[PDB]
Amino acid sequence: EVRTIKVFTTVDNINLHTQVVDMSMTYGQQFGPTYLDGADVTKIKPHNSHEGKTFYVLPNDDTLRVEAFEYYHTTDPSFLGRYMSALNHTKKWKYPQVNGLTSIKWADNNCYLATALLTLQQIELKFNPPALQDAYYRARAGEAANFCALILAYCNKTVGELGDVRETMSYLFQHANLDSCKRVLNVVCKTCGQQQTTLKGVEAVMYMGTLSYEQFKKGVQIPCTCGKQATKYLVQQESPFVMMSAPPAQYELKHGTFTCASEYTGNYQCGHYKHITSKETLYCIDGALLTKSSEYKGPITDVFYKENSYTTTIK
Numbered sequence: 001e002v003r004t005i006k007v008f009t010t011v012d013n014i015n016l017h018t019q020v021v022d023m024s025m026t027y028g029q030q031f032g033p034t035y036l037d038g039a040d041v042t043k044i045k046p047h048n049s050h051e052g053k054t055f056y057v058l059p060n061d062d063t064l065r066v067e068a069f070e071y072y073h074t075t076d077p078s079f080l081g082r083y084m085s086a087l088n089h090t091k092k093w094k095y096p097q098v099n100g101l102t103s104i105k106w107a108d109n110n111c112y113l114a115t116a117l118l119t120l121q122q123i124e125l126k127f128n129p130p131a132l133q134d135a136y137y138r139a140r141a142g143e144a145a146n147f148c149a150l151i152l153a154y155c156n157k158t159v160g161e162l163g164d165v166r167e168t169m170s171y172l173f174q175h176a177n178l179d180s181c182k183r184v185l186n187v188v189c190k191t192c193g194q195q196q197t198t199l200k201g202v203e204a205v206m207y208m209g210t211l212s213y214e215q216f217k218k219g220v221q222i223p224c225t226c227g228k229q230a231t232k233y234l235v236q237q238e239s240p241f242v243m244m245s246a247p248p249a250q251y252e253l254k255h256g257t258f259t260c261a262s263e264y265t266g267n268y269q270c271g272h273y274k275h276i277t278s279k280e281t282l283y284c285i286d287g288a289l290l291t292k293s294s295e296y297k298g299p300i301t302d303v304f305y306k307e308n309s310y311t312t313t314i315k
């Protein structure tokens with residue numbers, strides 16, 4: 001006796017593909033790798049409770065390949081398997097509202113993701129892939145499981161791995177509309193003279209070397225090919241924020257002088273991130289945990305600042 005049920009397959013959870021499945025065969029035998037809200041059902045035979053349900057499958061024909069690219073903006077063949085693997089964990093995480101923002105209760109080394117999510121809610125940023133637009137909208141409303149699983153997939157990180165906030169933000173910014181962001185730098189060597197550089201997009205909003213936006217405007221010392229130290233300073237900035245990053249070092253955050261910051265305690269192999277936000281006072285959001293202080297000092301790795309337009313007074 002042949003038994004069948006109707007199910008739907010998808011790559012984006014919007015466009016559905018009607019399937020009739022033989023209840024005598026695994027999902028794997030019929031569709032290849034198959035997932036039900038993140039759970040791998042490849043080796044499971046259809047249940048009666050499955051009728052009418054939506055299953056994710058890998059893009060295995062031209063229609064799904066186009067749908068997957070249009071939704072995620074990636075053709076990485078392992079992407080949906082990585083997204084589903086992460087989602088099976090992130091759907092069990094807790095997303096408390098802390099000081100009016102969606103955070104993440106600590107689990108599975110997810111401190112870097114909490115501080116990234118908190119930062120995103122404080123800066124002006126629009127994502128390009130519909131997957132991130134839709135998932136980020138849900139995250140802002142408090143249901144961040146899809147958004148967190150997408151960040152893990154886009155960053156090639158598995159649940160439990162040690163992430164870096166700077167690297168995570170770089171991936172998210174690659175998938176954001178930063179096209180009108182512009183930065184002009186001048187590099188002055190007492191031997192070699194002056195050289196101006198223009199940076200656009202993600203490179204216009206990220207700097208690695210100093211946490212202080214004010215120091216970057218005054219000048220920072222960098223190597224020159226001649227062997228001397230040159231001075232690099234900000235000539236012009238057009239962006240709605242900037243991110244200043246450096247290896248973790250004891251640093252004092254002053255209320256009203258920055259938007260938010262990431263603190264990292266530990267070493268190259270394991271550690272813990274916290275988030276500091278400057279509002280009516282300094283709030284330290286540590287997943288579900290919240291403390292406040294008038295002053296803050298700690299091993300800061302990243303600081304975000306509000307911007308619109310800046311032009312140097314240096315000649």
Ligand SMILES: [Cl-]
Nearest residue numbers: 010011012015
């Ligand atoms: Cl689809």
Ligand SMILES: [Cl-]
Nearest residue numbers: 126127133136
């Ligand atoms: Cl968006």
Ligand SMILES: [Zn+2]
Nearest residue numbers: 189192224226
């Ligand atoms: Zn030089």
